[PDB]
């Protein structure tokens, strides 16, 4: 298949590497690749993480300086502030380079053209599929984990080799796997989850609550217990991740299976239409525009919605309850 | 009629003139009006065009300085960057003036209020209808060419005279003609072409290709030949510009005439509705907003569409083909 | 690929060839194939072209006689009168044959069954994609040009060889290319152009004119200049034929690109529906019926539409104008 | 106004005139213009009318011969057979002419292009608005009558003079009037009457009958009396032609006026839509096509409808009744 399981590590031996940011990801990847025998540095502004990283045994310079000393760099910072950082501090230093390599963990700012590096550069991508708290929990066991790979600009005919070398340097393989893809096929996915089934799920739950209360005389303290205040859902998520989504259902009662299957095959076209609409909205680049503009205006909608959600009835009831069960 | 064929040239004799930009238009108008005996200068930042213009015999200062020495100025630069240039460098110098004149080749930035000069100023407009490469090709023959005229702000009761004098100074007349109009009636037109029949044409061609291939088993190498890979279309354009749009069709076969006429009178209401929608969208000023905002966000949609078009199947086939016919 | 670049010429050496009609095509193909060393004759009724052809060095007999002396024939006459000519003069002579070959430049009258030659005959097709005025302009340079090939009836297992030999005899190759296709895949194309984007374009232009005049107070003398009275369109056609349809747009301004792309991807489904309708109307054979019947009635609709178009307002304004610019 | 009341008669004095057909119109116009002192002949095939016309004192030749001896001709025959007559017998003789004039009483065959005379000819039109039986009934009183005039082709700058001279020669003026119009504005009218209010009227009557019988238990012998078997309707027609359409209603009862006016202003949009549809169907030339084709097929629809109408129930009842009242 397209799949990769293990590969070489020679192209990075002798080269210096710079890691931007020391948040969750940066700390993790940096520590690991240090264990695998690589000269590593860090670039960050003087704050909490700066002290922490220099404490953990890392030589710390600030960003532009780190890019001067590096032949490779990992830009592990939020997708909301990477633009200014790149424009002010990196791009200059980068114009003054010969053979450089630039890695990202997300393809948002590139797939949509908010960042357009030169042609003197190898532009790549390495995207894990784990939060970071569990990634360490797995590295201790010699286990790997999955990632996605992508290449946007090859100026040296060696980009893929570099990407696989990186994947190995951070402990994703061997033990896990690595898939080859694009920047687009990753942004698309990271977004479609956040736009299709998460919000649909939440709205469905909220609607069930509202209905049961205002049309069948149910008590608030019970709806919550049935819907999400119990650990029903994490159970199901686990059995899904392990046994499979459908085979997970054998451990339930026949009645549940029947209702679930019927109503699933019954409401499939509706959500399909929805998903089409949203995926199309993304592929074109409209959502990026929307979001950037909202940033420029002052996040008013964000504010008002955060209010409306918490000032809803369900949330207040949840509050009273969690307090009652002792859950902080 | 409203029409003008030739006029005087006295108001500009004794005055100095400054031309902003030395691209296609600026170079042309400047050279010509120099031939017609006028003291002329140039304003531009130190780049390629700067060297070229000083080479061709023009005294070159940078912009604000040129506006100080000038009683008249031609703002011949793209409509996408004129705003900042006007705000930073011109408007100050202009506040410190007594009797000035400002000419544009496009009414976009003014019709929509992105540029609001003072009342101490005569604001005019001179818009040709030729690319510039052919304008010289015609000036050598003593031929004129058409233009549009407009006036937004008259502080001296002499604006129209100035406009006609300019039209004569650049060689549009006599030999061609000059129409009086507004800034609005020019922006509207320059846009409606770019929003109605050009994109409709392209979409129709693309649809014909896709259909013929995916439903009637046609080969890609043939659809292109019929639709646009042949010089069919430039032929028709020429006969239109010369003989007339309809009289052009006499040189075709009766079958073609019949089909064309029937389907034309048959699909006229649809496109009419479309054109209404778009013209209305413009008259109000919504498109300017849209475009300005996209500039402020980072041109994401522009990017994604440029990609989707070139990564289409038709374009790849066109590529293979053009390479085969030797066309670069 | 399916494509052909050059081939043999042996099957026609020793055979006599008859060319029907001496209009644009006939004259061209005849002259050329004569240059390539082939015994050639001509068949036509005694009129202007008759004198011209005998002047240019061709032995001229009238039609049935030419078919008697020929082992191969090219039926290069309009698709509107070929039927009677075939029925009265050719088919008899043809019943009295042994091994014959019949070539067409269009598949209309055959694809739809208005002409059904016997099985004693090899029925083929050779369709150029150039007007004829430029074909000579290219033959002088040793250049070729594209054509389409097709076969309807093979009684000798040598039809394709004959077709390629012909293509070579008229100077299409080498230098150009030749595509293999059907009679249907050529009629379909020659028509879909005349039914989809040409009339749509014209209607869109007309609608823009009408709107701009009757709802925004524009002058007629300006709308025309923007829309087609300028050579805007032939420019674009040229850049399309040479650089490519989309790459052509880089030489325009960003604003134009943006509007064009957006409105193109926005109005693609509509025209797609239209094109489906028309292509289907053709594939079935309904348009041929329509057109034949109109011929039988006396061309009343043709007449009335030719009137309505020229008695429109746009045409009268165009007339006044062209007269003013001196354009005949 | 556009209107004409009397005019000269000099252009026809000294010229010979030929009248084609001796039916209702031909007989009338011929007799009259003979009374007004004009050399007149007749052209017709040897049948009943031939004997009649030669009896009434007319020198009779057959058609082509009459056109040779004539400088002016009146083509007074049905619009269904004029085409062949023109093609076979007239057009030849006409090619061999110098200065000729051709008059019609209907613009059908010309407005739609079924007859296209040369440019060596003056093509005109004179259309009365009376059946012919009453025209004589009025000529005896020295009264005139209305007509329409039109010109399609002027080769002598004298067409209008000829038309008015004709109008005077047939006794339409003075006493009546003459309106200037086109061939189109006459065919359109002659048809729209036959397509809009006549058939609507008939269908409404038929529907009233059917309803009253099959839903309110009415007797057939009474519905007819109310609807049309009485002379109600000719009364109203007379008062319309004399007093005016609306002023006609004062002689009726208030109840009738009220109902009529209300329901008239209530059902005006519907019939307006209908009339638009039909007038458009005509202006384009589609009805002429329809009718010509039906002639070519054998009048099957005509046949079947003539049957269905007479085999209806209303017609049979009308038959029984008329027989009962003695009405033949
Ligand atoms: Mg995310
Ligand atoms: Mg995710
Ligand atoms: Mg433009
Ligand atoms: Mg334009
Ligand atoms: Mg054709
Ligand atoms: Mg074509
Ligand atoms: Mg009639
Ligand atoms: Mg009538």
JSON list of N, CA and C in Angstrom, two decimals, chain D residues 171-226:
[
{"chain": "D", "resi": 171, "resn": "UNK", "atom": "N", "xyz": [-62.65, 52.91, -54.86]},
{"chain": "D", "resi": 171, "resn": "UNK", "atom": "CA", "xyz": [-63.78, 53.54, -54.20]},
{"chain": "D", "resi": 171, "resn": "UNK", "atom": "C", "xyz": [-63.74, 53.52, -52.69]},
{"chain": "D", "resi": 172, "resn": "UNK", "atom": "N", "xyz": [-62.59, 53.21, -52.09]},
{"chain": "D", "resi": 172, "resn": "UNK", "atom": "CA", "xyz": [-62.48, 53.29, -50.64]},
{"chain": "D", "resi": 172, "resn": "UNK", "atom": "C", "xyz": [-62.49, 54.73, -50.18]},
{"chain": "D", "resi": 173, "resn": "UNK", "atom": "N", "xyz": [-61.92, 55.63, -50.98]},
{"chain": "D", "resi": 173, "resn": "UNK", "atom": "CA", "xyz": [-61.90, 57.05, -50.65]},
{"chain": "D", "resi": 173, "resn": "UNK", "atom": "C", "xyz": [-62.15, 57.85, -51.92]},
{"chain": "D", "resi": 174, "resn": "UNK", "atom": "N", "xyz": [-62.68, 59.07, -51.78]},
{"chain": "D", "resi": 174, "resn": "UNK", "atom": "CA", "xyz": [-63.09, 59.66, -50.50]},
{"chain": "D", "resi": 174, "resn": "UNK", "atom": "C", "xyz": [-64.42, 59.11, -50.01]},
{"chain": "D", "resi": 175, "resn": "UNK", "atom": "N", "xyz": [-64.67, 59.26, -48.71]},
{"chain": "D", "resi": 175, "resn": "UNK", "atom": "CA", "xyz": [-65.86, 58.70, -48.10]},
{"chain": "D", "resi": 175, "resn": "UNK", "atom": "C", "xyz": [-65.48, 57.79, -46.95]},
{"chain": "D", "resi": 176, "resn": "UNK", "atom": "N", "xyz": [-64.39, 57.06, -47.13]},
{"chain": "D", "resi": 176, "resn": "UNK", "atom": "CA", "xyz": [-63.81, 56.26, -46.08]},
{"chain": "D", "resi": 176, "resn": "UNK", "atom": "C", "xyz": [-62.45, 56.81, -45.70]},
{"chain": "D", "resi": 177, "resn": "UNK", "atom": "N", "xyz": [-61.52, 55.95, -45.31]},
{"chain": "D", "resi": 177, "resn": "UNK", "atom": "CA", "xyz": [-60.18, 56.39, -44.97]},
{"chain": "D", "resi": 177, "resn": "UNK", "atom": "C", "xyz": [-59.16, 55.33, -45.35]},
{"chain": "D", "resi": 178, "resn": "UNK", "atom": "N", "xyz": [-57.89, 55.64, -45.14]},
{"chain": "D", "resi": 178, "resn": "UNK", "atom": "CA", "xyz": [-56.80, 54.74, -45.47]},
{"chain": "D", "resi": 178, "resn": "UNK", "atom": "C", "xyz": [-55.70, 54.93, -44.45]},
{"chain": "D", "resi": 179, "resn": "UNK", "atom": "N", "xyz": [-55.23, 53.83, -43.88]},
{"chain": "D", "resi": 179, "resn": "UNK", "atom": "CA", "xyz": [-54.18, 53.86, -42.87]},
{"chain": "D", "resi": 179, "resn": "UNK", "atom": "C", "xyz": [-52.91, 53.28, -43.46]},
{"chain": "D", "resi": 180, "resn": "UNK", "atom": "N", "xyz": [-51.79, 53.87, -43.11]},
{"chain": "D", "resi": 180, "resn": "UNK", "atom": "CA", "xyz": [-50.49, 53.39, -43.53]},
{"chain": "D", "resi": 180, "resn": "UNK", "atom": "C", "xyz": [-49.97, 52.45, -42.46]},
{"chain": "D", "resi": 181, "resn": "UNK", "atom": "N", "xyz": [-49.46, 51.30, -42.90]},
{"chain": "D", "resi": 181, "resn": "UNK", "atom": "CA", "xyz": [-48.97, 50.30, -41.98]},
{"chain": "D", "resi": 181, "resn": "UNK", "atom": "C", "xyz": [-48.01, 49.39, -42.73]},
{"chain": "D", "resi": 182, "resn": "UNK", "atom": "N", "xyz": [-47.70, 48.24, -42.16]},
{"chain": "D", "resi": 182, "resn": "UNK", "atom": "CA", "xyz": [-46.79, 47.28, -42.74]},
{"chain": "D", "resi": 182, "resn": "UNK", "atom": "C", "xyz": [-47.55, 46.03, -43.16]},
{"chain": "D", "resi": 183, "resn": "UNK", "atom": "N", "xyz": [-46.84, 45.15, -43.86]},
{"chain": "D", "resi": 183, "resn": "UNK", "atom": "CA", "xyz": [-47.38, 43.82, -44.11]},
{"chain": "D", "resi": 183, "resn": "UNK", "atom": "C", "xyz": [-47.53, 43.04, -42.82]},
{"chain": "D", "resi": 184, "resn": "UNK", "atom": "N", "xyz": [-46.60, 43.24, -41.89]},
{"chain": "D", "resi": 184, "resn": "UNK", "atom": "CA", "xyz": [-46.60, 42.50, -40.64]},
{"chain": "D", "resi": 184, "resn": "UNK", "atom": "C", "xyz": [-47.77, 42.91, -39.76]},
{"chain": "D", "resi": 185, "resn": "UNK", "atom": "N", "xyz": [-47.97, 44.21, -39.60]},
{"chain": "D", "resi": 185, "resn": "UNK", "atom": "CA", "xyz": [-49.03, 44.73, -38.76]},
{"chain": "D", "resi": 185, "resn": "UNK", "atom": "C", "xyz": [-50.41, 44.39, -39.29]},
{"chain": "D", "resi": 186, "resn": "UNK", "atom": "N", "xyz": [-50.52, 43.80, -40.47]},
{"chain": "D", "resi": 186, "resn": "UNK", "atom": "CA", "xyz": [-51.80, 43.34, -40.99]},
{"chain": "D", "resi": 186, "resn": "UNK", "atom": "C", "xyz": [-51.99, 41.84, -40.81]},
{"chain": "D", "resi": 187, "resn": "UNK", "atom": "N", "xyz": [-50.97, 41.05, -41.13]},
{"chain": "D", "resi": 187, "resn": "UNK", "atom": "CA", "xyz": [-51.04, 39.62, -40.88]},
{"chain": "D", "resi": 187, "resn": "UNK", "atom": "C", "xyz": [-51.26, 39.36, -39.40]},
{"chain": "D", "resi": 188, "resn": "UNK", "atom": "N", "xyz": [-50.48, 40.04, -38.56]},
{"chain": "D", "resi": 188, "resn": "UNK", "atom": "CA", "xyz": [-50.62, 39.91, -37.12]},
{"chain": "D", "resi": 188, "resn": "UNK", "atom": "C", "xyz": [-52.07, 40.09, -36.69]},
{"chain": "D", "resi": 189, "resn": "UNK", "atom": "N", "xyz": [-52.72, 41.12, -37.20]},
{"chain": "D", "resi": 189, "resn": "UNK", "atom": "CA", "xyz": [-54.09, 41.41, -36.79]},
{"chain": "D", "resi": 189, "resn": "UNK", "atom": "C", "xyz": [-55.06, 40.38, -37.35]},
{"chain": "D", "resi": 190, "resn": "UNK", "atom": "N", "xyz": [-54.99, 40.12, -38.65]},
{"chain": "D", "resi": 190, "resn": "UNK", "atom": "CA", "xyz": [-55.89, 39.15, -39.26]},
{"chain": "D", "resi": 190, "resn": "UNK", "atom": "C", "xyz": [-55.82, 37.81, -38.54]},
{"chain": "D", "resi": 191, "resn": "UNK", "atom": "N", "xyz": [-54.68, 37.50, -37.93]},
{"chain": "D", "resi": 191, "resn": "UNK", "atom": "CA", "xyz": [-54.55, 36.23, -37.24]},
{"chain": "D", "resi": 191, "resn": "UNK", "atom": "C", "xyz": [-54.98, 36.31, -35.78]},
{"chain": "D", "resi": 192, "resn": "UNK", "atom": "N", "xyz": [-54.54, 37.33, -35.06]},
{"chain": "D", "resi": 192, "resn": "UNK", "atom": "CA", "xyz": [-54.83, 37.40, -33.63]},
{"chain": "D", "resi": 192, "resn": "UNK", "atom": "C", "xyz": [-56.32, 37.34, -33.35]},
{"chain": "D", "resi": 193, "resn": "UNK", "atom": "N", "xyz": [-57.14, 37.90, -34.24]},
{"chain": "D", "resi": 193, "resn": "UNK", "atom": "CA", "xyz": [-58.58, 37.75, -34.10]},
{"chain": "D", "resi": 193, "resn": "UNK", "atom": "C", "xyz": [-58.97, 36.28, -34.17]},
{"chain": "D", "resi": 194, "resn": "UNK", "atom": "N", "xyz": [-58.43, 35.56, -35.14]},
{"chain": "D", "resi": 194, "resn": "UNK", "atom": "CA", "xyz": [-58.77, 34.16, -35.36]},
{"chain": "D", "resi": 194, "resn": "UNK", "atom": "C", "xyz": [-58.17, 33.24, -34.33]},
{"chain": "D", "resi": 195, "resn": "UNK", "atom": "N", "xyz": [-57.30, 33.74, -33.46]},
{"chain": "D", "resi": 195, "resn": "UNK", "atom": "CA", "xyz": [-56.64, 32.91, -32.47]},
{"chain": "D", "resi": 195, "resn": "UNK", "atom": "C", "xyz": [-56.98, 33.26, -31.04]},
{"chain": "D", "resi": 196, "resn": "UNK", "atom": "N", "xyz": [-57.60, 34.41, -30.77]},
{"chain": "D", "resi": 196, "resn": "UNK", "atom": "CA", "xyz": [-57.81, 34.83, -29.39]},
{"chain": "D", "resi": 196, "resn": "UNK", "atom": "C", "xyz": [-59.27, 34.89, -28.98]},
{"chain": "D", "resi": 197, "resn": "UNK", "atom": "N", "xyz": [-60.08, 35.79, -29.53]},
{"chain": "D", "resi": 197, "resn": "UNK", "atom": "CA", "xyz": [-61.38, 36.02, -28.92]},
{"chain": "D", "resi": 197, "resn": "UNK", "atom": "C", "xyz": [-62.50, 35.21, -29.56]},
{"chain": "D", "resi": 198, "resn": "UNK", "atom": "N", "xyz": [-62.36, 34.85, -30.82]},
{"chain": "D", "resi": 198, "resn": "UNK", "atom": "CA", "xyz": [-63.32, 33.99, -31.50]},
{"chain": "D", "resi": 198, "resn": "UNK", "atom": "C", "xyz": [-63.35, 32.62, -30.83]},
{"chain": "D", "resi": 199, "resn": "UNK", "atom": "N", "xyz": [-62.22, 31.91, -30.77]},
{"chain": "D", "resi": 199, "resn": "UNK", "atom": "CA", "xyz": [-62.24, 30.58, -30.16]},
{"chain": "D", "resi": 199, "resn": "UNK", "atom": "C", "xyz": [-62.55, 30.61, -28.68]},
{"chain": "D", "resi": 200, "resn": "UNK", "atom": "N", "xyz": [-62.08, 31.64, -27.98]},
{"chain": "D", "resi": 200, "resn": "UNK", "atom": "CA", "xyz": [-62.41, 31.77, -26.56]},
{"chain": "D", "resi": 200, "resn": "UNK", "atom": "C", "xyz": [-63.92, 31.90, -26.39]},
{"chain": "D", "resi": 201, "resn": "UNK", "atom": "N", "xyz": [-64.53, 32.77, -27.18]},
{"chain": "D", "resi": 201, "resn": "UNK", "atom": "CA", "xyz": [-65.98, 32.92, -27.15]},
{"chain": "D", "resi": 201, "resn": "UNK", "atom": "C", "xyz": [-66.68, 31.59, -27.37]},
{"chain": "D", "resi": 202, "resn": "UNK", "atom": "N", "xyz": [-66.28, 30.87, -28.42]},
{"chain": "D", "resi": 202, "resn": "UNK", "atom": "CA", "xyz": [-66.94, 29.61, -28.73]},
{"chain": "D", "resi": 202, "resn": "UNK", "atom": "C", "xyz": [-66.78, 28.61, -27.59]},
{"chain": "D", "resi": 203, "resn": "UNK", "atom": "N", "xyz": [-65.57, 28.49, -27.05]},
{"chain": "D", "resi": 203, "resn": "UNK", "atom": "CA", "xyz": [-65.35, 27.57, -25.96]},
{"chain": "D", "resi": 203, "resn": "UNK", "atom": "C", "xyz": [-66.14, 27.93, -24.73]},
{"chain": "D", "resi": 204, "resn": "UNK", "atom": "N", "xyz": [-66.27, 29.22, -24.45]},
{"chain": "D", "resi": 204, "resn": "UNK", "atom": "CA", "xyz": [-67.05, 29.66, -23.30]},
{"chain": "D", "resi": 204, "resn": "UNK", "atom": "C", "xyz": [-68.51, 29.27, -23.47]},
{"chain": "D", "resi": 205, "resn": "UNK", "atom": "N", "xyz": [-69.06, 29.50, -24.66]},
{"chain": "D", "resi": 205, "resn": "UNK", "atom": "CA", "xyz": [-70.45, 29.13, -24.92]},
{"chain": "D", "resi": 205, "resn": "UNK", "atom": "C", "xyz": [-70.63, 27.63, -24.72]},
{"chain": "D", "resi": 206, "resn": "UNK", "atom": "N", "xyz": [-69.76, 26.84, -25.35]},
{"chain": "D", "resi": 206, "resn": "UNK", "atom": "CA", "xyz": [-69.85, 25.40, -25.24]},
{"chain": "D", "resi": 206, "resn": "UNK", "atom": "C", "xyz": [-69.78, 24.94, -23.79]},
{"chain": "D", "resi": 207, "resn": "UNK", "atom": "N", "xyz": [-68.89, 25.56, -23.02]},
{"chain": "D", "resi": 207, "resn": "UNK", "atom": "CA", "xyz": [-68.74, 25.18, -21.62]},
{"chain": "D", "resi": 207, "resn": "UNK", "atom": "C", "xyz": [-69.99, 25.52, -20.83]},
{"chain": "D", "resi": 208, "resn": "UNK", "atom": "N", "xyz": [-70.56, 26.69, -21.07]},
{"chain": "D", "resi": 208, "resn": "UNK", "atom": "CA", "xyz": [-71.80, 27.06, -20.40]},
{"chain": "D", "resi": 208, "resn": "UNK", "atom": "C", "xyz": [-72.88, 26.03, -20.68]},
{"chain": "D", "resi": 209, "resn": "UNK", "atom": "N", "xyz": [-73.02, 25.63, -21.94]},
{"chain": "D", "resi": 209, "resn": "UNK", "atom": "CA", "xyz": [-74.00, 24.61, -22.29]},
{"chain": "D", "resi": 209, "resn": "UNK", "atom": "C", "xyz": [-73.75, 23.33, -21.51]},
{"chain": "D", "resi": 210, "resn": "UNK", "atom": "N", "xyz": [-72.55, 22.78, -21.64]},
{"chain": "D", "resi": 210, "resn": "UNK", "atom": "CA", "xyz": [-72.23, 21.51, -21.01]},
{"chain": "D", "resi": 210, "resn": "UNK", "atom": "C", "xyz": [-72.51, 21.56, -19.51]},
{"chain": "D", "resi": 211, "resn": "UNK", "atom": "N", "xyz": [-72.09, 22.64, -18.87]},
{"chain": "D", "resi": 211, "resn": "UNK", "atom": "CA", "xyz": [-72.26, 22.78, -17.43]},
{"chain": "D", "resi": 211, "resn": "UNK", "atom": "C", "xyz": [-73.73, 22.81, -17.07]},
{"chain": "D", "resi": 212, "resn": "UNK", "atom": "N", "xyz": [-74.46, 23.78, -17.63]},
{"chain": "D", "resi": 212, "resn": "UNK", "atom": "CA", "xyz": [-75.87, 23.92, -17.32]},
{"chain": "D", "resi": 212, "resn": "UNK", "atom": "C", "xyz": [-76.62, 22.62, -17.49]},
{"chain": "D", "resi": 213, "resn": "UNK", "atom": "N", "xyz": [-76.22, 21.81, -18.46]},
{"chain": "D", "resi": 213, "resn": "UNK", "atom": "CA", "xyz": [-76.94, 20.56, -18.69]},
{"chain": "D", "resi": 213, "resn": "UNK", "atom": "C", "xyz": [-76.55, 19.51, -17.66]},
{"chain": "D", "resi": 214, "resn": "UNK", "atom": "N", "xyz": [-75.26, 19.28, -17.48]},
{"chain": "D", "resi": 214, "resn": "UNK", "atom": "CA", "xyz": [-74.79, 18.12, -16.74]},
{"chain": "D", "resi": 214, "resn": "UNK", "atom": "C", "xyz": [-74.61, 18.37, -15.25]},
{"chain": "D", "resi": 215, "resn": "UNK", "atom": "N", "xyz": [-74.93, 19.56, -14.76]},
{"chain": "D", "resi": 215, "resn": "UNK", "atom": "CA", "xyz": [-74.79, 19.82, -13.33]},
{"chain": "D", "resi": 215, "resn": "UNK", "atom": "C", "xyz": [-75.97, 20.55, -12.71]},
{"chain": "D", "resi": 216, "resn": "UNK", "atom": "N", "xyz": [-76.89, 21.09, -13.50]},
{"chain": "D", "resi": 216, "resn": "UNK", "atom": "CA", "xyz": [-78.05, 21.79, -12.97]},
{"chain": "D", "resi": 216, "resn": "UNK", "atom": "C", "xyz": [-79.34, 21.32, -13.63]},
{"chain": "D", "resi": 217, "resn": "UNK", "atom": "N", "xyz": [-79.30, 20.21, -14.36]},
{"chain": "D", "resi": 217, "resn": "UNK", "atom": "CA", "xyz": [-80.51, 19.58, -14.84]},
{"chain": "D", "resi": 217, "resn": "UNK", "atom": "C", "xyz": [-81.30, 20.42, -15.81]},
{"chain": "D", "resi": 218, "resn": "UNK", "atom": "N", "xyz": [-80.63, 21.22, -16.62]},
{"chain": "D", "resi": 218, "resn": "UNK", "atom": "CA", "xyz": [-81.31, 22.07, -17.57]},
{"chain": "D", "resi": 218, "resn": "UNK", "atom": "C", "xyz": [-81.60, 21.29, -18.84]},
{"chain": "D", "resi": 219, "resn": "UNK", "atom": "N", "xyz": [-82.60, 21.75, -19.57]},
{"chain": "D", "resi": 219, "resn": "UNK", "atom": "CA", "xyz": [-82.95, 21.13, -20.84]},
{"chain": "D", "resi": 219, "resn": "UNK", "atom": "C", "xyz": [-82.11, 21.71, -21.97]},
{"chain": "D", "resi": 220, "resn": "UNK", "atom": "N", "xyz": [-81.71, 20.90, -22.94]},
{"chain": "D", "resi": 220, "resn": "UNK", "atom": "CA", "xyz": [-80.91, 21.44, -24.05]},
{"chain": "D", "resi": 220, "resn": "UNK", "atom": "C", "xyz": [-81.62, 22.51, -24.84]},
{"chain": "D", "resi": 221, "resn": "UNK", "atom": "N", "xyz": [-82.94, 22.41, -24.98]},
{"chain": "D", "resi": 221, "resn": "UNK", "atom": "CA", "xyz": [-83.69, 23.32, -25.83]},
{"chain": "D", "resi": 221, "resn": "UNK", "atom": "C", "xyz": [-83.74, 24.74, -25.28]},
{"chain": "D", "resi": 222, "resn": "UNK", "atom": "N", "xyz": [-83.26, 24.97, -24.06]},
{"chain": "D", "resi": 222, "resn": "UNK", "atom": "CA", "xyz": [-83.32, 26.26, -23.41]},
{"chain": "D", "resi": 222, "resn": "UNK", "atom": "C", "xyz": [-81.96, 26.96, -23.36]},
{"chain": "D", "resi": 223, "resn": "UNK", "atom": "N", "xyz": [-80.93, 26.19, -23.03]},
{"chain": "D", "resi": 223, "resn": "UNK", "atom": "CA", "xyz": [-79.57, 26.71, -23.05]},
{"chain": "D", "resi": 223, "resn": "UNK", "atom": "C", "xyz": [-79.27, 27.38, -24.38]},
{"chain": "D", "resi": 224, "resn": "UNK", "atom": "N", "xyz": [-79.60, 26.70, -25.48]},
{"chain": "D", "resi": 224, "resn": "UNK", "atom": "CA", "xyz": [-79.34, 27.26, -26.80]},
{"chain": "D", "resi": 224, "resn": "UNK", "atom": "C", "xyz": [-80.07, 28.57, -26.99]},
{"chain": "D", "resi": 225, "resn": "UNK", "atom": "N", "xyz": [-81.34, 28.62, -26.61]},
{"chain": "D", "resi": 225, "resn": "UNK", "atom": "CA", "xyz": [-82.10, 29.85, -26.74]},
{"chain": "D", "resi": 225, "resn": "UNK", "atom": "C", "xyz": [-81.41, 31.00, -26.02]},
{"chain": "D", "resi": 226, "resn": "UNK", "atom": "N", "xyz": [-80.92, 30.75, -24.81]},
{"chain": "D", "resi": 226, "resn": "UNK", "atom": "CA", "xyz": [-80.29, 31.84, -24.09]},
{"chain": "D", "resi": 226, "resn": "UNK", "atom": "C", "xyz": [-78.96, 32.24, -24.72]}
]
